[PDB]
Structures are given as structure tokens and as C-alpha cells.
């Protein structure tokens, strides 16, 4: 279990955020990998960010939670970087993924944001 987590979660919200990546990818606008996540994070444009629980070394994503406080955007975690890469359609892994436009998934990303604002508190 990594250092950078701020609140506990079950598979609840996390399986729904992985499901949101699986439909934002081909109905909306998305980027994958942590330096593209970090570009869309630093210049604000990522509406939701998803990070892995098994990054190794763990330190490469450790900026994404406090930097999402500094710019005021919601953030969430998921249990394996290879499965996050496969949800983002690529054949390697991804330590993080960024949503720029939810496409069809707006009510779903708004549920995730509204329920993550119960935990960032």
C-alpha cells in the first residue's frame, strides 16, 4: 500500500471510475500515462484523475494528490497499473489516466466528483 493515499475506499467508487475510463476513451477526450496526466493536471484541464495502487517506485505519482488540492480538482485510485493501462486501451501499463471531456459519461463523472467531495473533507 503506497504513501500518497488520503482517504480509505472499498471497491466502491474505484470500480465505477475504472468503468468511466472504459467509456470516456471512445465517447469523449482522454490522456494516459503520468507525464500527460501531469500536463493536464498542472494546466488544470483534467476534470478527473485516476491513479494506481501498485506504482513501483511509488514516488513517480506521489505529486498528483497534493497538486489536485492546489488547483481544486477531484482525484481517485484503482488497484493495478496494468489493468488501468488495459482500460485506457494500450498494451503496456499506466500509473495514471486523465479525463479532459467525459463524452457520454457526464452524469457518471459528476457522481464520482460529488462522492469524492464527501472524502476530501
Amino acid at each position: 500500500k503506497p504513501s500518497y493515499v488520503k482517504f480509505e475506499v472499498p471497491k466502491e467508487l474505484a470500480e465505477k471510475a475504472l468503468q468511466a475510463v472504459e467509456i470516456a476513451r471512445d465517447t469523449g477526450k482522454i490522456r494516459k500515462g503520468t507525464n500527460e496526466t501531469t500536463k493536464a493536471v498542472e494546466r488544470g484541464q483534467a476534470k478527473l484523475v485516476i491513479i494506481a495502487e501498485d506504482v513501483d517506485p511509488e514516488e513517480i505519482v506521489a505529486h498528483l494528490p497534493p497538486l489536485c488540492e492546489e488547483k481544486e480538482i477531484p482525484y481517485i485510485y484503482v488497484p493495478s497499473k496494468k489493468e488501468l493501462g488495459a482500460a485506457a486501451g494500450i498494451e503496456v501499463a499506466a500509473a495514471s489516466v486523465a479525463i479532459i471531456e467525459p463524452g457520454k459519461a457526464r452524469d457518471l463523472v459528476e457522481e464520482i466528483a460529488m462522492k469524492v467531495k464527501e472524502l476530501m473533507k
Partner: protein, 366 residues
Amino acid sequence: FISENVRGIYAFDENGNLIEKRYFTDKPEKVLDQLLKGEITKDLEELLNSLKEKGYDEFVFEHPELSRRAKELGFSATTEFPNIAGERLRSNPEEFLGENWFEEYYKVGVALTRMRIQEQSGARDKMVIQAIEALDDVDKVINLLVARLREWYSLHFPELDELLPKHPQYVAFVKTVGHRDNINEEVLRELGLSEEKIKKILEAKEKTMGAWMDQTDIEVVRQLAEEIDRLYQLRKKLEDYIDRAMDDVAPNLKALVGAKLAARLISLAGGLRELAMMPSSTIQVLGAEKALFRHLRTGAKPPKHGVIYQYPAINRSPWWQRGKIARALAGKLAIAARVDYFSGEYIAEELKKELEARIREIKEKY
């Protein structure tokens, strides 16, 4: 005038009488390593200020390069190894140190000789966590083999088990004394037992209830005690490693890109915080000066690299690889900054090995 020693540093006159001597204010094994290889130390700065304030100037030392650091710093220093200070102090320490002087020579000399080898592991906090588990697993095997040793030896002399409960003292009894009819009052003091413990044990020599081991039955129980003795020496080998290696600290950027380049890159980002927040795509172009300006303002081609061009595998290198290496360097640099800033652990020789695999693959591809 000066003489150079383990039991502090000493000053003597032209006639060979003592003036003053002073004791050290850092760990004496590190103070001797400096003074023996010819660089001067804070307690000798104070002794030569004492010698100056007494009204002497003719500061003859034993060593040439200690005398170099002295006159290079500004002192009135010269050199003669057989000078009257060393010719007195090393002829009879009894007049100056006290009669047990050889204990103080011994305890620092063996420490200096154990210390005269340099250290550079790649991820040493992890390579010491495994020694903390080795200390947990070493007491775990001792607390297993000594249970077998207790249960087997208590067939022959059970009057000892509840009386020597601290496991090393029971192992030393079974190793060194061994067979129960060897037991006498003198060998128990040669084992370090007290009179209060020696009234017991000897109480049982005439009246024990144990059943007989013969001369080479007790031998395999002694072999087990002789190998468990080495597991206590292995516990010392781990204790002496932990006391040396668990005090280490090293920055990652300082090893991955070198101190001066790391320190520069931290300021083109505004700070180490920013170098630990920013993306590799921006860390790639930090401090490119007017090449970044004309890429933004005039719409030119993006710069391939900023201040990372001073990296010792980009600066000399041919064009085919300079861009490919700059991209992977900016990623591995962003990782090293995140480790130094969020974690404060060291992995920099792993981060180098990965960029070195990518550079070998760049040769193997192009």
C-alpha cells in the same frame, strides 16, 4: 614542538618538557584518519592557538602535509618527524598518558583499521531492511536450536534449565563445561557465574536425577553448542553492520545527474517542489533560453533540450541519440526529484542502470 597521538594531541619545548596536551571533540578514529593522511583538525587548531597565546612561534610538526595545511591556512609551520616532542612522547608514554595507555591505542587502532574502506551501495535503506529482518530471523533460529539443546541436555542434568534461563549463558555452559561430572567451583568462575549461582549447580553435583550420556554422546550436543556460539557471533556481525549502515543518507539527484547540474536544474524550475511536481515534457526544456522564446513567441520548432544538455551523456554525444536520451533523461530526472522530495530514500544507482539500459538499446536500435 607538536607531537601527533591517539590519547589527544601534544606540545613540547626545545628541551623536551611538556607545555600542554588536548583531547578530541569528534570520534577519535575519524580524527586520526584526517591527521594521519595530513589534514588538520579543530582540537589541534585550539592547541596551536594555546601555543601562540603562550608566546611561541616556531611550530615544527612531525608530518609534512599536516604542516602544509597549517602554513597554507596561515600558521608559522615547519616539519621534523624526529623532533623532541615525538622523541619524548613515543619513548615513554608513562610520563604523559598513564600506565594503561595501550588500552587507548588498542581500542581506536582496531577501529581505524576496520573503518579504512569506503562505502557506495545502490539502494542501501532496502539493503539494511533485509538486515533488520536478518536480526529478527537470527534470534528466531537461536530461540529454536537452544530449545532443542535445553530438552536434550536436560536428559542428563535437568537441574540447570530454570537456573540459567538467559539462552547465551546456557549455550556457553554446554559448549565450554559440557559433561556434568566436569563441573567444579573454579570452571564456573572461569564461565563468569556469581557465588549466589554457584551454591546451586554444585548442590546438584552429588544428587542430580538425570540419566547418563557417554563420552561421544555429549560430543554431538557440544557440536550443536559450538555452532550456536557462531550464531551469537553472527548476531554481532549484524549488530556491527546496523550500527554502521543504518546512519547513511544520500540525495538521488546528486548521484543521477551530479551535484552542480542537479543544483542548477532545481532553480530553473523555481524550486525542488516544482521539479517534483512538473511533467517530464517541461523538465526537458528548463533554461533553454532564446530557443524556448522563439518556439513560443515566433512559432519555431520546439527545443530538443534545455539545461539537461549539460548532462554527461548528452553534451558530447552524436545527433542520432541526443534527442532520444534527452526524453528518457527528463523522465528519470522527474522520478529522482520525486524521491528526494516526497520520500527521502535512495535508489539512484537503479535509476542510472535503467537509463543505461535505454542508452544501450538506443545503440542497439540506431
